[PDB]
Design a protein around this ligand. Structure first.
Ligand code: HEM
Ligand code: HEM
Ligand code: HEM
Ligand code: HEM
Lengths: 139, 145, 138, 145
């Protein structure tokens, strides 16, 4: 129940993000550790200081995962199956944390791309990040 | 409740904010991005598409009105409970708004600050505002029975 | 989510509940409104006094629906489709409130049936209430 | 934080509670009902079947500790950020535990209490405990940073 408008809203916006994706995913995570400090319990082994290369590296791995969900909006349960193993089984990440991250993905995209952050696009991104969170936490 | 550096950022930024424009925008978006909320606002008129909402005169006005209780709260950071007690009764007894829905406005207001101030909107400035925003929502909820 | 071991558990236990389903249905609700006052916001047009008859009437409809899901554990999303429309599209109930009911439903099955409410059955009942809440909110 | 009547119901009920068995049960069930939590207790011996869990010597011993902690909370309701401050830092800095998980032990603790007191565990008494178990979860999450 992403609609035709959601999908193309999102592909268009992701299209514009381009090769800043990993940059943004780095920033989203930083924002999340910072605004929502319990998210850190899940990274007790990273260097989580400002500019930390580890967070940057992870930022890329996140943004790539999302690029690949944008490519496969029609079968997210399929596309993201490995990743929902990880987060649902191995890591047990409370669904509350996902809300924190997607909120910070929104703030980040808003900070850098206000021209596309129109209310309709904002509506679609929020649905998309939800769909991805449901798929990642559903087992 | 907020360290002085924090209060410095919060006030610093809230000083540049056009209460007029950001108000309608936050509430507009609440209604576009989370349309189920429309139920509570039927008396406002045409709440059909996004362009209907972002231009609706009433929406815009209520917006400004919400944002002021924010400012009142800011001016009263260290006792938020008292500053919202009556809005808390209101949203509870006249309104029947599940307080879960308070986070939603908070987050939207936060997104609008990011949309407006762009690169000025630090990971740190935001961390302070989330604190505000989570606090505001705690107060408006405290008087539910 | 919900092994075959899990479904025996729920079934066997629902057997014992039998004729008390609706009576528990109501008690859990009076407990929900009662510990999680916020849930009350979805029933502003109800009479919610302790022992309100309108709640007992509602309490029954919840139980039958629960009995309903117990008999379609293998495809809940289909059985309950009409109910997720009501709860997602029409009323739009925040997913947090489902946790509150499912909790109090469990506390309800515990006051009444301590013998049957063994940890394995506790675990099973949970994944079941949880599995249901998932269908109704999606 | 708690009315004079709410404190009546709470302590009136807690005086009756056998701190031994109730601990090793709240805790025992946390483990079966939400088995992913077993990871935090890997140095507890055999935890591979409900049977073995319920009856594990080191699970029951932890129970009592958890429960006397709870006991001390009741001597201190008026200031619970006070009573659990050292435990908050513990669960954060040492154990790295998502505070969300506190909900779960409060919940299982509420279920055990119901298992044990049936008719005596009425909607009103339960509403007293939730307020406590909500507060014990908030106090534990307070010194996260
Ligand atoms: C949209 C949301 C998310 C996406 C798209 C995502 C994606 C990813 C990806 C691509 C990896 C890399 C796996 C690998 O390196 O092979 C990963 C790992 C991981 N994720 Fe997420 N993730 C998301 C949300 C979260 C959240 C909210 C948390 C908890 C706050 C979390 C915790 C972790 C941890 C702890 C690891 C690996 C541990 C390590 O790097 O040593 N993830 N995730
Ligand atoms: C986040 C913090 C919020 C604040 C500070 C706030 C504040 C206010 C205030 C001050 C009023 C006063 C109306 C008057 O001028 O007398 C009001 C009215 C109202 N509020 Fe909120 N509110 C918040 C969130 C929400 C949410 C989430 C909803 C529901 C989705 C909501 C629904 C309403 C409604 C329906 C009215 C009455 C509108 C009318 O019919 O005239 N509020 N609010
Ligand atoms: C297992 C969980 C739940 C089940 C099985 C369930 C089932 C039902 C059923 C059978 C109805 C009756 C509709 C009819 O009579 O045609 C109903 C209606 C309703 N439910 Fe629930 N429900 C659940 C959770 C919740 C929760 C958590 C809330 C919010 C506190 C809620 C709010 C409502 C409301 C407001 C109605 C309509 C009442 C009316 O206007 O008559 N439900 N649900
Ligand atoms: C109701 C909320 C909780 C309370 C009141 C509580 C209480 C306690 C207490 C009193 C201790 C003893 C500290 C010491 O021996 O120095 C402790 C330690 C510990 N806690 Fe908890 N706890 C709670 C929730 C949780 C949860 C959900 C987990 C798991 C996710 C957890 C994991 C642990 C672990 C692993 C230890 C140390 C065990 C050891 O190796 O000796 N706590 N906690």
């Amino acid at each position: 129940v992403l609609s035709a408008a959601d999908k193309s809203n999102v592909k268009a916006c992701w299209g514009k993000i381009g090769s800043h994706a990993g940059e943004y995913g780095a920033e989203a995570l930083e924002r999340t550790f910072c605004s929502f400090p319990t998210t850190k319990t899940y990274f007790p082994h990273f260097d989580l200081s400002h500019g930390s290369a580890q967070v940057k590296a992870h930022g890329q791995k996140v943004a790539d995962a999302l690029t690949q969900a944008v490519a496969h909006m029609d079968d997210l349960p399929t596309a993201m199956s490995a990743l929902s193993d990880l987060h649902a089984y191995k890591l047990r990440v409370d669904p509350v944390n996902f809300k924190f991250l997607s909120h910070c993905l929104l703030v980040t995209l808003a900070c850098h791309h206000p021209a596309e952050f129109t209310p309709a696009v904002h509506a679609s991104l929020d649905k998309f990040f939800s769909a991805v969170s449901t798929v990642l936490t559903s087992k | 409740f907020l360290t002085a550096e924090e209060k410095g950022l919060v006030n610093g930024l809230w000083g540049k904010v056009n209460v007029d424009e950001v108000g309608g925008e936050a509430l507009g978006r609440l209604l576009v991005v989370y349309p189920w909320t429309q139920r509570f606002f039927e008396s406002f008129g045409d709440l059909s598409s996004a362009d209907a909402i972002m231009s609706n005169a009433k929406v815009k006005a209520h917006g400004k009105k919400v944002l002021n209780s924010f400012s009142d709260g800011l001016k009263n950071i260290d006792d938020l409970k008292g500053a919202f007690a009556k809005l808390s009764e209101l949203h509870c007894d006249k309104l029947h708004v599940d307080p879960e829905n308070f986070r939603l406005l908070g987050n939207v207001l936060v997104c609008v600050l990011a949309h407006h101030f762009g690169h000025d909107f630090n990971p740190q400035v935001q961390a302070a505002f989330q604190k505000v925003v989570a606090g505001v929502a705690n107060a408006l909820a405290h008087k539910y029975h």
